[PDB]
């Protein structure tokens, strides 16, 4: 839990692009 609004702002905003990889890419950012 963040400190309300500390993130979401940019938080919620960064999966407006980070999750491209947050949901993809990122799989292999673990490899095995």
């Known amino acids: 839990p963040p400190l309300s609004q500390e993130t ?3 938080l919620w905003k960064l999966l407006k692009k980070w999750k491209m990889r947050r ?10």
């Open 8 to 10: 979401f702002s940019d």
């Open 23 to 32: 949901n993809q890419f990122w799989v292999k950012v673990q490899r095995g």
